[PDB]
Amino acid sequence: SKLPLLTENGGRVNRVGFTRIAREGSIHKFGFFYEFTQESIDFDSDDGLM
Amino acid sequence: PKHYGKTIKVYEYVPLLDDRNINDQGIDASGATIVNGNLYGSSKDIGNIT
């Protein structure tokens, strides 16, 4: 029922259109940290703690 | 030094002839077991020492 049949007379028949889409992504920020005192590394048994 | 906590410990070695040398190793001159293993300890009495 939707075939682009064309007659001998031509004319403005079977005009089509096009479209495009836009994709998108974004970045976000992350991070974490830890704290320590001088005594927690100086008096700690393990010198390789850090 | 580092990595040994905050406490310092040291041994004191009591002399053989001391009243606070309390041990159960005592065997007397005749071979009998005695309650003291420090000979006469801190005694200064001639009778006890003899």
XYZ file of all heavy atoms in Angstrom:
785
model
N 0.809 -1.212 0.000
C 0.000 0.000 0.000
C 0.846 1.266 0.000
O 0.329 2.337 -0.336
C -0.931 0.004 1.212
O -0.239 0.392 2.385
N 2.126 1.172 0.366
C 2.992 2.339 0.491
C 4.165 2.301 -0.485
O 5.172 2.980 -0.264
C 3.495 2.461 1.931
C 2.571 3.270 2.828
C 2.707 2.881 4.290
C 1.731 3.660 5.157
N 1.706 3.173 6.561
N 4.057 1.526 -1.561
C 5.124 1.483 -2.547
C 5.155 2.784 -3.351
O 4.109 3.382 -3.618
C 4.937 0.298 -3.491
C 5.273 -1.087 -2.934
C 4.925 -2.167 -3.945
C 6.742 -1.176 -2.545
N 6.346 3.246 -3.750
C 6.427 4.492 -4.542
C 6.146 4.265 -6.023
O 7.021 4.359 -6.890
C 7.863 4.955 -4.275
C 8.621 3.699 -4.060
C 7.683 2.742 -3.382
N 4.894 3.951 -6.336
C 4.503 3.761 -7.726
C 4.566 5.085 -8.477
O 4.163 6.131 -7.962
C 3.095 3.174 -7.807
C 2.875 1.845 -7.079
C 1.504 1.285 -7.412
C 3.966 0.841 -7.428
N 5.076 5.033 -9.705
C 5.295 6.219 -10.521
C 4.604 6.040 -11.864
O 4.794 5.019 -12.531
C 6.794 6.470 -10.723
C 7.196 7.796 -11.367
C 6.866 8.966 -10.456
C 8.676 7.779 -11.710
N 3.809 7.030 -12.256
C 3.103 6.998 -13.527
C 3.953 7.630 -14.627
O 5.021 8.195 -14.381
C 1.761 7.724 -13.421
O 1.986 9.129 -13.256
C 0.953 7.200 -12.242
N 3.460 7.526 -15.863
C 4.162 8.115 -16.996
C 4.178 9.635 -16.941
O 5.009 10.257 -17.609
C 3.520 7.659 -18.307
C 2.140 8.250 -18.558
C 1.455 7.644 -19.763
O 2.063 7.641 -20.855
O 0.306 7.175 -19.623
N 3.282 10.245 -16.165
C 3.190 11.697 -16.099
C 4.162 12.312 -15.100
O 4.279 13.541 -15.056
C 1.762 12.112 -15.737
C 0.807 12.000 -16.910
O -0.202 11.300 -16.840
N 1.119 12.698 -17.998
N 4.860 11.502 -14.312
C 5.784 12.056 -13.337
C 5.059 12.944 -12.347
O 4.017 12.578 -11.794
N 5.614 14.131 -12.115
C 5.023 15.082 -11.197
C 5.583 14.967 -9.796
O 6.527 14.225 -9.513
N 4.977 15.731 -8.892
C 5.382 15.749 -7.489
C 4.691 14.594 -6.777
O 3.602 14.736 -6.221
C 5.041 17.085 -6.844
C 5.696 18.279 -7.514
C 5.733 19.478 -6.589
N 7.073 19.711 -6.057
C 7.373 19.843 -4.771
N 6.444 19.791 -3.829
N 8.640 20.034 -4.419
N 5.338 13.432 -6.798
C 4.822 12.229 -6.157
C 5.977 11.511 -5.477
O 7.103 11.497 -5.988
C 4.118 11.297 -7.168
C 2.920 12.000 -7.794
C 5.096 10.821 -8.237
N 5.698 10.917 -4.317
C 6.674 10.115 -3.583
C 7.865 10.966 -3.135
O 9.023 10.686 -3.450
C 7.138 8.924 -4.429
C 5.983 8.144 -5.018
O 4.961 7.939 -4.366
N 6.139 7.702 -6.259
N 7.555 12.021 -2.386
C 8.578 12.821 -1.728
C 8.837 12.264 -0.336
O 7.901 11.945 0.401
C 8.154 14.287 -1.633
C 9.307 15.234 -1.328
C 8.853 16.679 -1.227
N 7.887 16.879 -0.153
C 7.460 18.063 0.262
N 7.899 19.187 -0.282
N 6.569 18.124 1.248
N 10.115 12.147 0.018
C 10.526 11.560 1.283
C 11.341 12.586 2.065
O 11.733 13.632 1.547
C 11.334 10.260 1.090
C 10.509 9.228 0.334
C 12.642 10.542 0.365
N 11.587 12.266 3.338
C 12.396 13.109 4.190
C 13.360 12.273 5.008
O 13.295 11.042 5.016
N 14.259 12.966 5.699
C 15.280 12.332 6.517
C 15.306 12.985 7.891
O 14.728 14.052 8.108
C 16.660 12.422 5.852
C 16.685 11.909 4.442
C 16.549 12.778 3.374
C 16.844 10.559 4.184
C 16.570 12.311 2.074
C 16.866 10.085 2.888
C 16.729 10.962 1.832
N 15.986 12.327 8.827
C 16.118 12.847 10.181
C 17.429 12.354 10.774
O 18.009 11.368 10.318
C 14.938 12.428 11.070
O 14.857 13.300 12.204
C 15.101 10.998 11.558
N 17.891 13.065 11.801
C 19.091 12.688 12.528
C 18.846 12.871 14.019
O 17.992 13.657 14.436
C 20.310 13.508 12.078
C 20.269 14.974 12.474
C 21.433 15.736 11.864
N 21.320 17.175 12.073
C 21.996 18.087 11.387
N 22.854 17.746 10.440
N 21.808 19.375 11.662
N 19.608 12.128 14.819
C 19.489 12.155 16.270
C 20.839 12.549 16.853
O 21.890 12.374 16.231
C 19.026 10.794 16.836
C 17.628 10.448 16.321
C 19.019 10.809 18.356
C 17.347 8.964 16.290
N 20.801 13.093 18.067
C 21.998 13.499 18.791
C 22.109 12.682 20.070
O 21.179 12.669 20.884
C 21.964 14.996 19.113
N 23.240 12.009 20.242
C 23.580 11.328 21.484
C 24.542 12.202 22.276
O 25.253 13.036 21.711
C 24.224 9.965 21.216
C 23.559 9.129 20.133
C 22.284 8.475 20.628
N 21.812 7.450 19.704
C 20.842 6.586 19.971
N 20.207 6.596 21.131
N 20.500 5.692 19.048
N 24.568 12.005 23.593
C 25.419 12.832 24.434
C 25.792 12.091 25.709
O 25.017 11.289 26.235
C 24.732 14.165 24.767
C 23.573 14.067 25.750
C 23.174 15.418 26.310
O 23.303 16.425 25.584
O 22.726 15.472 27.474
N 26.997 12.379 26.193
C 27.449 11.890 27.482
C 28.342 12.932 28.119
O 28.911 13.790 27.437
N 28.463 12.849 29.442
C 29.211 13.841 30.201
C 30.059 13.149 31.259
O 29.806 12.003 31.642
C 28.278 14.864 30.861
O 27.193 14.225 31.508
N 31.074 13.869 31.728
C 32.003 13.361 32.723
C 31.575 13.854 34.099
O 30.900 14.877 34.244
C 33.462 13.780 32.420
C 33.549 15.290 32.177
C 33.991 13.021 31.215
C 34.960 15.828 32.169
N 31.978 13.112 35.128
C 31.710 13.466 36.514
C 32.979 13.284 37.334
O 33.896 12.557 36.945
C 30.571 12.624 37.104
C 29.265 12.791 36.391
N 28.934 12.068 35.265
C 28.209 13.598 36.644
C 27.730 12.425 34.856
N 27.267 13.351 35.675
N 33.021 13.956 38.482
C 34.212 14.018 39.316
C 34.087 13.066 40.499
O 33.010 12.925 41.086
C 34.442 15.445 39.814
C 35.872 15.739 40.220
C 36.022 17.168 40.709
C 37.483 17.559 40.840
N 37.644 18.997 41.178
N 35.198 12.414 40.844
C 35.246 11.453 41.936
C 36.522 11.668 42.737
O 37.467 12.314 42.276
C 35.208 10.006 41.430
C 33.979 9.662 40.643
C 33.871 10.023 39.312
C 32.941 8.958 41.228
C 32.744 9.703 38.582
C 31.812 8.632 40.503
C 31.715 9.005 39.179
N 36.543 11.115 43.948
C 37.744 11.149 44.760
C 37.523 10.829 46.225
O 36.420 11.006 46.750
N 38.573 10.356 46.894
C 38.528 10.086 48.323
C 39.940 10.189 48.883
O 40.925 10.207 48.142
C 37.909 8.714 48.623
C 38.571 7.572 47.902
C 39.508 6.782 48.545
C 38.244 7.281 46.589
C 40.112 5.728 47.888
C 38.846 6.229 45.928
C 39.781 5.452 46.578
N 40.027 10.261 50.209
C 41.289 10.520 50.886
C 41.259 9.891 52.271
O 40.204 9.515 52.784
C 41.557 12.026 50.991
C 40.795 12.696 52.098
C 41.429 13.070 53.270
C 39.442 12.954 51.963
C 40.727 13.686 54.288
C 38.735 13.568 52.977
C 39.378 13.936 54.139
N 42.442 9.780 52.874
C 42.572 9.334 54.254
C 43.588 10.212 54.972
O 44.461 10.824 54.352
C 42.983 7.856 54.345
C 44.386 7.556 53.870
C 45.434 7.434 54.773
C 44.661 7.382 52.522
C 46.716 7.153 54.345
C 45.938 7.098 52.086
C 46.963 6.986 53.000
O 48.236 6.706 52.564
N 43.460 10.261 56.295
C 44.266 11.123 57.146
C 45.033 10.291 58.164
O 44.631 9.180 58.519
C 43.389 12.147 57.878
C 43.132 13.420 57.101
C 42.287 14.407 57.879
O 41.404 13.961 58.641
O 42.505 15.628 57.733
N 46.147 10.848 58.636
C 46.965 10.175 59.634
C 47.783 11.214 60.386
O 48.028 12.315 59.890
C 47.884 9.130 58.993
C 48.663 9.650 57.820
C 49.966 10.091 57.980
C 48.096 9.695 56.557
C 50.687 10.568 56.904
C 48.813 10.172 55.479
C 50.109 10.609 55.653
N 48.199 10.845 61.593
C 49.060 11.676 62.419
C 50.507 11.202 62.314
O 50.799 10.114 61.813
C 48.602 11.651 63.882
O 48.850 10.356 64.443
C 47.119 11.968 63.989
N 51.422 12.045 62.796
C 52.833 11.676 62.798
C 53.084 10.487 63.717
O 53.875 9.595 63.387
C 53.686 12.873 63.219
C 55.184 12.600 63.277
C 55.838 12.634 61.909
O 55.717 11.691 61.127
N 56.534 13.723 61.613
N 52.422 10.458 64.876
C 52.621 9.362 65.817
C 52.113 8.040 65.257
O 52.660 6.981 65.580
C 51.919 9.674 67.138
C 52.565 10.795 67.932
C 52.041 10.878 69.352
O 51.172 10.057 69.713
O 52.493 11.765 70.103
N 51.073 8.079 64.423
C 50.503 6.856 63.872
C 51.446 6.150 62.908
O 51.172 5.006 62.533
C 49.186 7.167 63.164
O 49.414 7.697 61.870
N 52.535 6.796 62.495
C 53.499 6.190 61.582
C 54.862 6.101 62.256
O 55.684 5.247 61.905
C 53.588 6.981 60.264
C 53.940 8.444 60.538
C 52.279 6.886 59.501
C 54.194 9.257 59.288
N 55.116 6.981 63.228
C 56.410 6.985 63.902
C 56.477 5.931 64.999
O 57.505 5.264 65.158
C 56.691 8.370 64.486
C 57.443 9.272 63.526
O 57.661 8.866 62.365
O 57.819 10.391 63.935
N 55.400 5.768 65.763
C 55.361 4.791 66.841
C 54.763 3.459 66.415
O 54.888 2.479 67.157
C 54.565 5.349 68.028
C 55.192 6.558 68.663
C 54.438 7.687 68.932
C 56.536 6.565 68.994
C 55.013 8.799 69.516
C 57.116 7.673 69.577
C 56.354 8.792 69.838
N 54.127 3.395 65.251
C 53.551 2.145 64.781
C 54.643 1.109 64.543
O 55.756 1.428 64.116
C 52.756 2.374 63.497
C 51.762 1.267 63.221
O 50.618 1.357 63.714
O 52.122 0.302 62.514
N 54.311 -0.152 64.828
C 55.294 -1.223 64.702
C 55.796 -1.349 63.269
O 56.995 -1.544 63.039
C 54.689 -2.545 65.173
O 54.055 -2.394 66.430
N 54.896 -1.247 62.296
C 55.246 -1.435 60.895
C 55.723 -0.114 60.305
O 54.963 0.859 60.254
C 54.050 -1.972 60.110
C 54.456 -2.641 58.813
O 55.641 -2.542 58.435
O 53.588 -3.266 58.171
N 56.978 -0.081 59.864
C 57.515 1.086 59.177
C 57.112 1.144 57.710
O 57.379 2.154 57.052
C 59.042 1.107 59.294
C 59.689 -0.166 58.783
O 59.369 -0.594 57.654
O 60.523 -0.742 59.514
N 56.481 0.094 57.187
C 56.002 0.086 55.819
C 54.514 0.347 55.728
O 53.878 0.030 54.718
N 53.944 0.929 56.786
C 52.500 1.129 56.842
C 52.015 2.016 55.701
O 50.991 1.726 55.070
C 52.120 1.736 58.194
C 50.654 2.105 58.425
C 49.779 0.863 58.442
C 50.508 2.889 59.719
N 52.739 3.102 55.421
C 52.293 4.042 54.397
C 52.270 3.400 53.017
O 51.364 3.664 52.219
C 53.188 5.281 54.404
C 52.991 6.140 55.635
S 51.765 7.427 55.336
C 50.420 6.859 56.374
N 63.836 4.527 69.847
C 63.757 4.475 68.385
C 62.311 4.448 67.901
O 61.361 4.356 68.679
C 64.484 3.173 68.044
C 64.252 2.308 69.221
C 64.201 3.219 70.420
N 62.165 4.532 66.583
C 60.843 4.503 65.974
C 60.268 3.091 65.995
O 60.997 2.096 66.028
C 60.905 5.002 64.530
C 61.124 6.494 64.374
C 61.070 6.890 62.907
C 61.245 8.383 62.717
N 61.245 8.764 61.278
N 58.938 3.017 65.975
C 58.198 1.779 65.751
C 58.258 0.824 66.937
O 58.181 -0.393 66.754
C 58.697 1.072 64.487
C 58.758 1.964 63.287
N 57.661 2.656 62.820
C 59.785 2.291 62.469
C 58.010 3.366 61.762
N 59.292 3.161 61.528
N 58.390 1.350 68.155
C 58.376 0.534 69.365
C 57.439 1.103 70.423
O 57.657 0.890 71.619
C 59.792 0.395 69.930
C 60.648 -0.604 69.189
C 61.546 -0.191 68.218
C 60.561 -1.961 69.469
C 62.333 -1.103 67.540
C 61.342 -2.879 68.797
C 62.227 -2.445 67.836
O 63.007 -3.356 67.165
N 56.397 1.819 70.007
C 55.484 2.399 70.969
C 56.121 3.551 71.727
O 57.058 4.204 71.260
N 55.596 3.800 72.927
C 56.066 4.885 73.775
C 56.711 4.411 75.068
O 57.222 5.243 75.823
C 54.902 5.827 74.114
C 54.324 6.552 72.911
C 53.263 7.552 73.327
C 52.711 8.304 72.133
N 51.613 9.230 72.520
N 56.707 3.109 75.344
C 57.215 2.566 76.593
C 58.581 1.930 76.372
O 58.866 1.407 75.291
C 56.246 1.527 77.171
O 54.966 2.133 77.383
C 56.766 0.982 78.491
N 59.422 1.988 77.400
C 60.743 1.372 77.394
C 60.839 0.447 78.599
O 60.453 0.821 79.710
C 61.859 2.435 77.417
C 63.219 1.793 77.142
C 61.880 3.165 78.748
C 64.316 2.794 76.885
N 61.344 -0.766 78.374
C 61.455 -1.777 79.416
C 62.895 -2.251 79.517
O 63.609 -2.314 78.513
C 60.533 -2.968 79.138
C 59.062 -2.670 79.361
C 58.215 -3.916 79.203
C 56.753 -3.627 79.487
N 55.896 -4.829 79.306
N 63.314 -2.589 80.736
C 64.684 -3.002 81.011
C 64.673 -4.025 82.139
O 63.839 -3.970 83.048
C 65.577 -1.790 81.369
C 65.138 -1.171 82.686
C 67.045 -2.192 81.418
N 65.608 -4.971 82.068
C 65.774 -5.983 83.102
C 66.747 -5.505 84.171
O 67.695 -4.768 83.884
C 66.293 -7.294 82.510
C 65.244 -8.216 81.928
C 65.472 -8.891 80.737
C 64.038 -8.437 82.582
C 64.527 -9.743 80.205
C 63.087 -9.287 82.058
C 63.336 -9.938 80.870
O 62.392 -10.785 80.341
N 66.502 -5.930 85.407
C 67.452 -5.792 86.501
C 67.768 -7.185 87.027
O 66.854 -7.943 87.371
C 66.897 -4.905 87.616
C 67.837 -4.746 88.802
C 67.219 -3.961 89.940
O 66.095 -3.442 89.769
O 67.859 -3.862 91.007
N 69.052 -7.520 87.091
C 69.487 -8.831 87.553
C 69.928 -8.724 89.008
O 70.895 -8.024 89.322
C 70.618 -9.361 86.674
C 70.140 -9.870 85.334
C 70.024 -9.015 84.247
C 69.798 -11.204 85.156
C 69.584 -9.470 83.022
C 69.357 -11.671 83.934
C 69.253 -10.799 82.870
O 68.815 -11.256 81.650
N 69.215 -9.415 89.888
C 69.502 -9.339 91.324
C 70.757 -10.147 91.630
O 70.998 -11.177 90.975
C 68.304 -9.850 92.126
C 68.576 -9.764 93.621
C 67.057 -9.060 91.761
N 71.581 -9.739 92.596
C 72.728 -10.568 92.978
C 72.287 -11.852 93.667
O 71.185 -11.956 94.208
C 73.524 -9.668 93.932
C 73.021 -8.289 93.686
C 71.593 -8.443 93.295
N 73.177 -12.846 93.633
C 72.888 -14.124 94.275
C 72.589 -13.938 95.758
O 71.603 -14.473 96.278
C 74.067 -15.079 94.078
C 74.121 -16.334 94.952
C 72.933 -17.240 94.680
C 75.426 -17.079 94.723
N 73.431 -13.179 96.458
C 73.276 -12.965 97.898
C 72.434 -11.712 98.141
O 72.927 -10.637 98.485
C 74.642 -12.865 98.565
C 75.498 -14.130 98.500
C 76.952 -13.805 98.790
C 74.978 -15.176 99.468
N 71.127 -11.876 97.954
C 70.171 -10.792 98.125
C 68.866 -11.352 98.669
O 68.410 -12.412 98.234
C 69.922 -10.059 96.801
C 69.355 -8.667 97.002
O 68.459 -8.503 97.856
O 69.808 -7.737 96.306
N 68.269 -10.633 99.623
C 67.022 -11.088 100.227
C 65.881 -11.156 99.223
O 64.965 -11.965 99.402
C 66.632 -10.172 101.388
C 67.308 -10.554 102.691
O 68.016 -11.584 102.721
O 67.130 -9.826 103.688
N 65.911 -10.338 98.173
C 64.870 -10.368 97.156
C 65.172 -11.353 96.035
O 64.432 -11.390 95.048
C 64.646 -8.964 96.581
C 65.778 -8.430 95.721
C 65.881 -6.911 95.818
N 67.245 -6.435 95.610
C 67.690 -5.856 94.502
N 66.902 -5.649 93.460
N 68.961 -5.471 94.440
N 66.240 -12.142 96.159
C 66.479 -13.278 95.270
C 65.711 -14.472 95.827
O 66.225 -15.289 96.595
C 67.968 -13.568 95.143
C 68.254 -14.809 94.317
O 67.378 -15.320 93.621
N 69.484 -15.297 94.389
N 64.447 -14.567 95.424
C 63.531 -15.588 95.916
C 63.354 -16.630 94.821
O 62.858 -16.319 93.730
C 62.182 -14.978 96.325
C 62.376 -13.975 97.466
C 61.208 -16.069 96.736
C 61.214 -13.023 97.645
N 63.756 -17.864 95.108
C 63.677 -18.939 94.132
C 63.649 -20.267 94.869
O 63.924 -20.338 96.069
C 64.847 -18.886 93.142
C 66.191 -19.059 93.819
O 66.625 -20.178 94.084
N 66.857 -17.948 94.102
N 63.306 -21.320 94.130
C 63.172 -22.660 94.681
C 64.299 -23.590 94.250
O 64.131 -24.812 94.296
C 61.822 -23.255 94.280
C 61.689 -23.439 92.781
O 62.512 -22.870 92.034
O 60.756 -24.147 92.348
N 65.441 -23.042 93.838
C 66.560 -23.854 93.378
C 67.459 -24.331 94.512
O 68.416 -25.066 94.248
C 67.403 -23.061 92.376
C 66.676 -22.688 91.098
C 66.168 -23.897 90.344
O 66.934 -24.792 89.994
N 64.866 -23.929 90.087
N 67.178 -23.940 95.752
C 68.080 -24.196 96.857
C 68.251 -25.650 97.250
O 67.278 -26.344 97.561
N 69.497 -26.114 97.240
C 69.892 -27.384 97.838
C 71.062 -27.100 98.768
O 72.040 -26.465 98.361
C 70.264 -28.433 96.773
C 69.040 -28.776 95.920
C 70.826 -29.688 97.429
C 69.348 -29.601 94.692
N 70.960 -27.563 100.011
C 71.906 -27.158 101.040
C 73.218 -27.933 100.905
O 73.437 -28.698 99.962
C 71.286 -27.339 102.425
C 71.222 -28.794 102.864
O 71.536 -29.693 102.058
O 70.851 -29.038 104.031
N 74.109 -27.720 101.877
C 75.431 -28.336 101.823
C 75.361 -29.840 102.044
O 76.260 -30.571 101.611
C 76.349 -27.692 102.860
N 74.314 -30.321 102.712
C 74.148 -31.749 102.937
C 73.323 -32.425 101.850
O 73.085 -33.635 101.940
C 73.493 -31.990 104.299
O 72.081 -32.011 104.191
N 72.891 -31.686 100.831
C 72.107 -32.247 99.753
C 70.609 -32.186 99.944
O 69.875 -32.696 99.088
N 70.130 -31.581 101.026
C 68.701 -31.519 101.289
C 68.081 -30.288 100.640
O 68.711 -29.234 100.519
C 68.433 -31.499 102.793
N 66.828 -30.435 100.217
C 66.090 -29.317 99.647
C 65.777 -28.287 100.726
O 65.385 -28.641 101.842
C 64.796 -29.817 99.000
O 65.108 -30.671 97.895
C 63.949 -28.652 98.512
N 65.952 -27.011 100.392
C 65.676 -25.912 101.307
C 64.783 -24.903 100.600
O 64.743 -24.836 99.368
C 66.971 -25.238 101.812
C 67.952 -25.030 100.656
C 67.610 -26.076 102.908
C 69.099 -24.104 100.987
N 64.059 -24.111 101.395
C 63.090 -23.169 100.845
C 63.737 -21.966 100.182
O 63.090 -21.300 99.368
C 62.121 -22.672 101.939
C 61.172 -23.786 102.349
C 62.884 -22.131 103.145
N 64.995 -21.671 100.502
C 65.695 -20.518 99.956
C 66.833 -20.990 99.067
O 67.496 -21.986 99.368
C 66.238 -19.622 101.074
C 67.368 -20.272 101.847
O 67.155 -21.233 102.586
N 68.576 -19.752 101.677
N 67.053 -20.270 97.968
C 68.110 -20.609 97.036
C 69.105 -19.483 96.853
O 69.766 -19.389 95.814
N 69.220 -18.620 97.863
C 70.140 -17.490 97.833
C 71.180 -17.577 98.945
O 71.750 -16.554 99.336
C 69.366 -16.175 97.936
C 68.478 -16.116 99.161
O 68.167 -17.140 99.764
N 68.069 -14.912 99.537
N 71.439 -18.780 99.457
C 72.359 -18.971 100.572
C 71.865 -18.194 101.789
O 70.781 -18.487 102.304
C 73.775 -18.555 100.170
C 74.355 -19.342 98.989
C 75.696 -18.771 98.557
C 74.490 -20.816 99.336
N 72.633 -17.214 102.268
C 72.207 -16.395 103.395
C 71.679 -15.030 102.973
O 71.353 -14.213 103.839
C 73.354 -16.229 104.402
C 74.624 -15.626 103.845
C 74.753 -14.254 103.680
C 75.699 -16.432 103.501
C 75.914 -13.702 103.179
C 76.863 -15.890 102.997
C 76.967 -14.525 102.840
O 78.128 -13.985 102.339
N 71.577 -14.767 101.673
C 70.956 -13.533 101.219
C 71.685 -12.309 101.736
O 72.914 -12.213 101.666
N 70.917 -11.353 102.257
C 71.455 -10.103 102.776
C 71.761 -10.173 104.266
O 71.861 -9.128 104.920
C 70.481 -8.957 102.499
O 70.242 -8.815 101.111
N 71.914 -11.374 104.815
C 72.174 -11.518 106.238
C 73.567 -11.008 106.590
O 74.514 -11.144 105.813
C 72.037 -12.983 106.651
O 72.009 -13.116 108.060
N 73.681 -10.411 107.776
C 74.964 -10.015 108.336
C 75.261 -10.702 109.659
O 76.241 -10.343 110.321
C 75.017 -8.494 108.534
C 75.129 -7.699 107.247
C 74.946 -6.214 107.508
C 75.047 -5.404 106.231
N 74.720 -3.970 106.461
N 74.448 -11.674 110.064
C 74.655 -12.380 111.322
C 75.668 -13.498 111.116
O 75.539 -14.298 110.184
C 73.329 -12.934 111.838
C 73.509 -13.914 112.978
O 74.417 -13.704 113.808
O 72.738 -14.894 113.047
N 76.680 -13.551 111.985
C 77.725 -14.562 111.851
C 77.133 -15.957 112.007
O 77.504 -16.892 111.287
C 78.850 -14.307 112.871
C 79.609 -13.028 112.513
C 79.804 -15.489 112.921
C 80.351 -12.411 113.675
N 76.206 -16.120 112.951
C 75.607 -17.428 113.160
C 74.840 -17.920 111.947
O 74.976 -19.073 111.536
N 74.015 -17.050 111.363
C 73.240 -17.442 110.191
C 74.147 -17.715 108.997
O 73.944 -18.682 108.254
C 72.220 -16.357 109.852
C 71.266 -16.779 108.758
O 70.523 -17.747 108.906
N 71.284 -16.055 107.645
N 75.154 -16.865 108.792
C 76.057 -17.042 107.657
C 76.811 -18.359 107.782
O 76.964 -19.102 106.807
C 77.021 -15.847 107.550
C 76.270 -14.600 107.081
C 78.163 -16.164 106.598
C 76.977 -13.305 107.409
N 77.290 -18.667 108.989
C 78.067 -19.885 109.192
C 77.232 -21.126 108.895
O 77.714 -22.077 108.268
C 78.604 -19.931 110.623
O 79.585 -18.902 110.802
C 79.231 -21.284 110.920
